[PDB]
Symmetry: D3
Subunit: 252 residues, 6 copies
């Protein structure tokens, strides 16, 4: 009867999250049982549709981790349907303006605080009769910052009461600033942009998250005071592991 | 051409992946690494027929030979996988000559076996001359994972219509009264594994083995195993995630 | 070769409809074979995606009931794809303005009456060569009224020629008015709002539907002159039935 | 712990749900009611392996022990369900001691049976010490639904590796030449059902029964049945919908 | 009523479609053409149980009798398809009287067979009086596709609980040592096919045959075949696409 | 390592494409192996959802043909998710204005040329390390012209740099102009409209495609200089073939 990421935050500690681009329940449960506070299912840069995300949310919850979704788009009706299927954290792409941040906030909260439609199929099963009283606290909402425009509008995005804060996509931010879309990019202008967003989030009393492609990059981001750190995509970790196993099998 | 059979014909072993996670994306990505084949496990996984079918397509596009470790040595199940573009079969619990003959029966059209004719995907890969070459397009391995199979190894290896045997060493360890540890050092299990390899090669047959690590796979290749699997997608992914979390949390 | 809800209406009788939040064809056919005129598949407050709705529409039609969908969102392209898969009734959420009611109407009718795209895969199989001539009559469209704004705009929503009328969500209307989201809410302000919408729909020569959580509430709504009454969600009926079976099994 | 086995160890019977409708949402909701277990029917339903797999997860999250009534007493099918987190098995058409031995063979690792080792989901629930306790994590019941099974009840009950028997009373009614009515009052069927219960308890074994109603389930619990199912999701939902329509239409 | 059985009772043969492509849309569209039945092939296709279930619904809505050609003559597989609204069964590799008896056992409730009782979809179509008429709602055909089946034709035809036999002429051609060509002119295959038809009609039983073309189907109907399939969705679609491309490219 | 449609165009030859409304991989691979340059999966006038399109794209690529998708809607996030699943051609419906053509272009190209989000799961596997350098060339984008409005705005639609050109839906264009939605319509006003669009596309140095319901109509469109010709829908070809087989089986 608590959001595990929110419990971390209430203790003044960051949350470490997994990141799934591969559909299915077995790896979802296994990774949820490791020392992850949450597991983010990526519905943007993956082949995971609604049909496949639904049982994965169940598997992550059984594993003991908070099920999160990175959506395809900041669409209120998509986000509401994931909340009612037991997604307890939302990362919405391409939040570039206050109005887009208000669109995300609108989907996370029942009236009067937003316009979330009422039919909480799975949250009512998890939280029971006392769900509606605490519904807003059961859900974490992060607006993605991955453009020049979002960078320019960061203080107006952070002024929106109904979002917990922001989630940095460093590779898309690198690409939008005219740099190589490198995994864990340390391009100086992108590093400055990322530090600026982190500073503005904490100045506004808001949370800041970041996508990492490695444990090493995630350690530095945790040391820099990021509230929500993801590492690393199941597909990238599996491909790296398989390459290494093959190299060791084939070695002289 | 069957890429495993090409390895063997060029005097080289095959290195194979091993999938317990359903889905096409990791299947294609691992197929594109330096694997000759990728085995889809339909026994110790939740992969049903519905999920295996597009995975075989994804492995083939990746450039690796799609293999299936079946739930059971059942001829009709094996025939449906062959017609869906499974070009290698590893059948569990082949403990007798008669069970090895049941496996062979499913891999070959009449007169050599009783494979039913309707090759939906092989006829697309191989074209109208598929029948003449059908037996050579498929690799069949009988699993050795019991004391009984170990006792009957010579009679299993006498069946002309299987390429040879595939050692399941965790089940073999368990059936011998030892811990079911992958890549075991247990003296009796190591002796039994070497024995099966020696008997397979003495009978002019191929021998494969399931491995949990690249380091163990290297030794098995050096010992002369024809078909070496390393390592299950789920085991590799869990180990990689544990390590990433340890690096993140210092 | 008739919409069964439209046949009820042409005889001056209301239609009684089922309501499915559980995916699958077996309960869909079984409930379609009961004394329901239609069966609504809920794609908003359920885990039912397009992949799962498609065979359910087939099952409801075989059962003898009119297949309806309550969509996730009033999106024309979503609604058109359901019509071409054999959805013969559409209930669109969050129709708060005339322009939003015009967006719903646009999806239900071929040019010149709307902008429905032509490729009627399943309706052409049901209706045969005479489909295009009667296509608009084969489909029932209802705009959902579940906000203060929709209540304020009810006469402008009802002025849209291409919708059959409106569908009241009483629980969301209760929540949006600052009341408890109760099943079959009788909160006085919500009861007044609901009676107002019914009066305005019938004054405009339009149909009014309502969601019910019970047979008892549905009987009253039919007695009040509602044209389209749903009762009750498969999940709620199944959970209530299971609770009662367990209570009888465990009794002294 | 296996929640049915905990009931039994604390001298209480288990009350179970029964699912013929595929999907996770009703499975979790019913699991969260006062059911000790929820049986997924893979025989008299359209539930295939693809659909059962996430349902077992949903029941476990709900707090109930996930059970499966299989299509057939097939060892390889049963082993794949155990490795997907089925913690109870009800196998149809167990008519002989040999068929009861086939069921037991699938539930236990060597030396006690021939269960293949690769416990994907049980190793996640139970951790690295799963092998030592694997047999106790699983409840196995042989179905009694024929005159033959009734005649062979003592020989079926002599098999040490099954917890006991599960009466399918509609099929038993049909095979005795009576109407296949659930919760039957047919004198001969009631006598046969009481006989099976008496013989199971005399052999120190558990007895279960399929029920169509809460009222019949109450009597079966009062008679000393260890495992009582009431009632199928489809039958409960159809009855509830008929009643709602009758109330709506006056 | 079973629409194939209605044809037969009115002294007419049935013409059937044949589906190797999964999905409901083509299944309903072809069901609405002048086919009496539509066979879903679960052997030489990637159609699993998950995909067959909604296809049976789609064919029934179309107005044609839904049939399944199973992967194997397995009673439990056949019973699950009957309870999902398969109203015709074509079982492969029926080579002996005992195998024909195994098919009959699955199609009939006790006392006539051992069909398990839980008719989910037939009870919705036929209502509470389904048991009394269940056997007549289902058409059962044993496949003849081997020299052995040909040799045992009289003993196969002696089994009262099958409507008759279904010739698989490509497999029969292959097992006789000929090219597995559909609609073959091979003298010995044509003689064997006529022989099976003559023996089926002499025993008061029905005979069906798989055809690759409308022209061959016309001849088989003129020869007195009771159940004629023409032609597989995949073969018809590929031929149609080749022709469209030839017309487009001049 | 080339888009097969783009290779045709670079040789000054048109591409011939298949058209799939039936879900599944087996017919997709079989048709891909015929003398088609591409195979279009229709996600608008079909029951094919994302879950079903994903393995079909794999099957078409294995067959040797370029996998294309006709989307349900011109939605950037939908189009991006198909590109990352190995859709290498996009046909977007209801492009009626320059701004709508700019919305399509925005989804097909990484920054600076558009705003495509970076996570190319399947294109990175096909193209390897040299993908980002050539990413825009790997993808073909066509705006659908199927309304009066699109016809009126054809030169403004064709002025958008980031689209290869346009795709004519002749049946929807017939319907929107107040004519019968006939397969391969030769309604004089529709034939004039279609010739006008073809002339304007080639005057702007842009490509023009067209949907055909027959090989005979496709031959004429190729002879008229259309760059991209589809013929014919799998469902229509299969139903026609089945009718003919039945007629031959039943003939005296
Ligand atoms: Mg609402
Ligand atoms: Mg055959
Ligand atoms: Mg259109
Ligand atoms: Mg084993
Ligand atoms: Mg039974
Ligand atoms: Mg992005």
């Amino acid at each position: 009867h608590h959001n595990k990421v929110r419990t971390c935050w209430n203790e003044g500690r960051p949350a470490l999250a997994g990141w799934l681009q591969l559909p299915g329940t077995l790896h979802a449960e296994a990774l949820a049982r490791l020392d992850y506070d949450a597991v983010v299912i990526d519905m943007q840069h993956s082949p995971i549709d609604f049909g496949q995300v639904a049982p994965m949310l169940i598997a992550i919850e059984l594993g003991g981790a908070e099920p999160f979704v990175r959506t395809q788009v900041n669409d209120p009706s998509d986000i509401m349907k994931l909340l009612d299927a037991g997604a307890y954290g939302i990362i919405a792409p391409m939040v570039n303006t206050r109005a887009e941040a208000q669109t995300l906030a609108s989907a996370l909260h029942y009236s009067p605080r937003g316009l979330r439609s009422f039919g909480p199929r799975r949250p009512s099963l998890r939280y029971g009769s006392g769900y509606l009283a605490q519904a807003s606290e059961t859900v974490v909402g992060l607006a993605m910052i991955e453009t020049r425009e979002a960078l320019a509008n960061i203080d107006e995005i952070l002024s929106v009461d109904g979002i917990d804060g922001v989630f940095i996509g460093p590779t898309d931010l690198a690409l939008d600033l005219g740099h190589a879309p490198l995994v864990d990019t340390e391009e100086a202008e992108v590093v400055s942009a990322i530090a600026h967003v982190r500073e503005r989030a904490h100045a506004a009393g808001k949370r800041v998250g970041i996508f990492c492609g490695s444990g090493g990059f995630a350690r530095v981001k945790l040391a820099e005071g990021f509230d929500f750190v993801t590492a690393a995509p199941d597909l990238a970790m599996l491909s790296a592991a398989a390459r290494q196993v093959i190299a060791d099998a084939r070695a002289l």
